Every structure is written in structure tokens, then in C-alpha cells.
Amino acid sequence: LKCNQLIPPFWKTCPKGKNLCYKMTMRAAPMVPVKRGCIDVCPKSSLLIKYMCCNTDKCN
Amino acid sequence: LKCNQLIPPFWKTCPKGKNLCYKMTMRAAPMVPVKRGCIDVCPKSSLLIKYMCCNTDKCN
Amino acid sequence: LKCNQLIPPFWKTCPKGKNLCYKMTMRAAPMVPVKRGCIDVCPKSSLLIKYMCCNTDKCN
Amino acid sequence: LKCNQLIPPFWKTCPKGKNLCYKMTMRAAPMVPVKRGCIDVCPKSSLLIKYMCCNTDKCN
Amino acid sequence: LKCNQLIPPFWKTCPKGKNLCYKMTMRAAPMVPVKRGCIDVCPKSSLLIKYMCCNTDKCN
Amino acid sequence: LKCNQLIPPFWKTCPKGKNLCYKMTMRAAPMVPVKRGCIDVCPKSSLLIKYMCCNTDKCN
Ligand SMILES: [Cl-]
Ligand SMILES: [Cl-]
Ligand SMILES: [Cl-]
Ligand SMILES: [Cl-]
Ligand SMILES: [Cl-]
Ligand SMILES: [Cl-]
Ligand SMILES: [Cl-]
Ligand SMILES: [Cl-]
Ligand SMILES: [Cl-]
Ligand SMILES: [Cl-]
Ligand SMILES: [Cl-]
Ligand SMILES: [Cl-]
Ligand SMILES: [Cl-]
Ligand SMILES: [Cl-]
Ligand SMILES: [Cl-]
Ligand SMILES: [Cl-]
Ligand SMILES: [Cl-]
Ligand SMILES: [Cl-]
Ligand SMILES: [Cl-]
Ligand SMILES: [Cl-]
Ligand SMILES: [Cl-]
Ligand SMILES: [Cl-]
Ligand SMILES: [Cl-]
Ligand SMILES: [Cl-]
Ligand SMILES: [Cl-]
Ligand SMILES: [Cl-]
Ligand SMILES: [Cl-]
Ligand SMILES: [Cl-]
């Protein structure tokens, strides 16, 4: 699995065990990602914060 | 299949016969979705109204 | 004059020359306005879009 | 007064009436600005959201 | 003079004799401030410990 | 093993080979740790930095 990240080169390969791509944003400002990378379990979203997780190459 | 929605808790399980997730927005205003949920047939887009459809959990 | 908006901080002071607040809604999705802001002339409503205008702080 | 903004050219001149530069961030992620520009009054911060305001050229 | 601090409500008014605001961080960890408040003399930095000092409201 | 961290989401699963959780604190600012994470060997404390290590989920 390959996922997008914030800084150049903008992509990376995930380690064994981290099999999800994720993106964190402010729910009120969906166009600016704050964190972007590989993870093992999807974190809990809240009213103000959203975590999106997916498992297809460069889906995040 | 689970899809994102506008009302708390912000997700729902789709009923029998809806096998896609979707999002509806106005051209040049991508940060304000006006419709978000489960659907049967993906609608056709026009100059002002844009639709996106997908088939994995909370992809919309 | 100060009007409501859909993007943070959810309020805005209008420039001199814009003395009305407004709301814009698409007929295809009547429960969710696509824009809230300041304007100089209230636009005529059409077959696809409805407009509502008012003149006091946070009326829209 | 001149202030920084998010997209290229990364700077701009403020209108008359907007005499403060601002930056909005998630309190837990101080290195990624979500919004950046000119404003008239500083918005209220909260536990999760911080607004920083200043009035010297390119202070934000 | 008002300065930012780590404890809620996240700001304080400085007492007589403290005419500067400051922030203390470790090199390569700018997102975790370990000290933040009002001060008299700005301390000298070293290889691992970095200090910044300023003189306008909530500049730190 | 799962350890606490200072950056969102405030928890992390350690890679195979890292079987301890730790906390790092500078003697110049004893009330605020600068880092929390996973490690393989607990480092010796020095004149400037103190280290604490433990072996169970979210102990650090
Ligand atoms: Cl593994
Ligand atoms: Cl979103
Ligand atoms: Cl990552
Ligand atoms: Cl990784
Ligand atoms: Cl399901
Ligand atoms: Cl449905
Ligand atoms: Cl057609
Ligand atoms: Cl077009
Ligand atoms: Cl066009
Ligand atoms: Cl006003
Ligand atoms: Cl305008
Ligand atoms: Cl609304
Ligand atoms: Cl407007
Ligand atoms: Cl306007
Ligand atoms: Cl003016
Ligand atoms: Cl900050
Ligand atoms: Cl602006
Ligand atoms: Cl402006
Ligand atoms: Cl003061
Ligand atoms: Cl003090
Ligand atoms: Cl010296
Ligand atoms: Cl160095
Ligand atoms: Cl070095
Ligand atoms: Cl574990
Ligand atoms: Cl590692
Ligand atoms: Cl702590
Ligand atoms: Cl770590
Ligand atoms: Cl690690």
C-alpha cells in the first residue's frame, strides 16, 4: 500500500502493520489537510475534527 | 456499505438496493456539500451541479 | 452592517456599498443553502435558484 | 498594511477598514495554518481553535 | 501588555516590570512549547534550547 | 504495545523491536515533557535531560 503525505515527494510506502491511508481535517475547513499518511486503526472523529481512512493506493 | 451524511452522527448504514455513496456540490464551492448519503443510480452532472459516486465505506 | 456566512468565523462586516445580507438556495436541494453573505442588489429568483435578502445584522 | 495569505503570491494589501492580519490553526497542530489574511475584529478562540491577530506588515 | 500561556484561559496580563512576552522550545520540536508567558530579560539561546521574545499583545 | 504521544491522535502502536514506552523532560522546565513515544533501550539520564520508561499500554 502506497499513500499520500503532506510534504514533497507527496507519497510514500506504508510499513507492514500500517494498512490504512488517512487524512485529518477541521470539519468546517475540508480543503486544507492538517495530517496525511499511513496508520493501523482509524482514530475517532468528533464534531470539530474529522479523520478519513481508506485502503486503495493514494486514496487519501 | 456505510456512507457519510450531513446530520449527526455523520454516517449511516445503507438499506437494501442502494450500493453506492455520493456527494452533491455547486461548481466553484467544493467546501459546502448540499446533499450526502446512499444512492441507487449515480446522477448525471451539468455545468453548475457536480456529483461524485463511490463504492467503499465512507468514501464520500 | 454584519451578515452571517457559511465558512469560519461564520460572520462578516460588509464593505461600504453593500447594504443587504442574502441567502442562495438551489431548487434541487431545498434544505441546504449554498451561500450566505453581503450584496448591493437582490438578484431575481429563477427556475433553478432562489434568493432571499434582508437589511439588519445577522438576518440571513 | 500588508499581510500574508495561503496561496501564491503569499502576500496582499488589506482594504480600508480591515486593519489586522490573522492566522487560524488547530491548537494541537500549530505548524499548519488553515486560514490566513486581513480582518477588522479578531474572532474568539476556543479550546480546539486558535485565532492569532497582529498589526505590523507580514506578522501573520 | 497581554501574553499567551499554557494554562486556560491561555492568556494573562503581565505585572509591573515584565515588558516582554516569550516562548521556549527544544530544537527540532517547534510544535511543543515547554514555557510561555511574561518575562523581564530575554534569555540567551543554546544548541538545544531556543527562546524567542516580542513586545506586542499575544505575540508569543 | 501501545504508548501515549503528545501529537494527535495522542496514542501510537509501536513497531516490532520497540518494547518500552518513554517520557523525556528537560531539567530547565520540569513540569512539561518534550516527547512521549516508543523505544527499544531506555537512555541514561544526564545533567540536562531526565528519562522514564515503562512496559504496559499507555503507561508513559
Ligand atoms: Cl507487522
Ligand atoms: Cl469532508
Ligand atoms: Cl505516516
Ligand atoms: Cl509510516
Ligand atoms: Cl456495512
Ligand atoms: Cl438512504
Ligand atoms: Cl446524456
Ligand atoms: Cl466550467
Ligand atoms: Cl463557464
Ligand atoms: Cl457594522
Ligand atoms: Cl466585494
Ligand atoms: Cl444552514
Ligand atoms: Cl459576501
Ligand atoms: Cl462582500
Ligand atoms: Cl473604510
Ligand atoms: Cl500557537
Ligand atoms: Cl482576507
Ligand atoms: Cl481582504
Ligand atoms: Cl494590557
Ligand atoms: Cl508573570
Ligand atoms: Cl554570551
Ligand atoms: Cl543546529
Ligand atoms: Cl548539530
Ligand atoms: Cl498492541
Ligand atoms: Cl522506528
Ligand atoms: Cl503533559
Ligand atoms: Cl515514537
Ligand atoms: Cl516508534
Q: What does this 3D model show about the protein?
A:
Six copies of one chain form a homohexamer. Chain A has 60 residues and is mostly beta strands. Chain A has a single domain, classed as CD59. The first copy, chain A, is built from no helices and five strands. Chain A has strands at residues 2-4, 11-13, 20-26, 35-39, 49-54. The first copy, chain A, has a three-stranded antiparallel sheet, with no helix packed on it. Chain A has a two-stranded antiparallel sheet with strand order 1-2. In chain A, a hairpin with an 8-residue loop joins strand 3 and strand 4. Chain A is globular. The first copy, chain A, starts with a strand and ends in a 6-residue tail after the last strand. The interface between A and B is small, with 10 and 7 residues. Residues 16-17 of chain D line the site of one chloride ion. Chains A, B, C, D, E, F: It is found in: Secreted; Target cell membrane. Chains A, B, C, D, E, F: Pfam families: Toxin_cobra-type.
So, CATH architecture of chain A? Answer: Ribbon
The largest chain-to-chain contact, stated as pair and per-chain residue counts, equals: B-C, 10 and 9 residues
Biggest sheet, spatial arrangement of strands of chain A: 4-3-5
> Any ligands, ions or cofactors bound here, and which?
chloride ion
- The helix/strand order of chain A is EEEEE
The third-level CATH topology of chain A is CD59
How would you describe the oligomerization state of the chains in this entry? homohexamer
User: How many β-strand stretches of chain A?
Assistant: 5
Roughly how many Å is the radius of gyration of chain A?
Answer: 11 Å
Annotated CATH homologous superfamily of chain A? CD59
Strand content of chain A: 35-45%
Number of domains of chain A: 1
The number of helices of chain A is 0
* CATH class annotation of chain A: Mainly Beta
Q: Main β-sheet of chain A: number of strands, strand sense, barrel status?
A: 3 strands, antiparallel
Subcellular location (chains A, B, C, D, E, F): Secreted; Target cell membrane
Main location (chains A, B, C, D, E, F): secreted
Protein name (chains A, B, C, D, E, F): Cytotoxin 1
GO molecular function (chains A, B, C, D, E, F): toxin activity
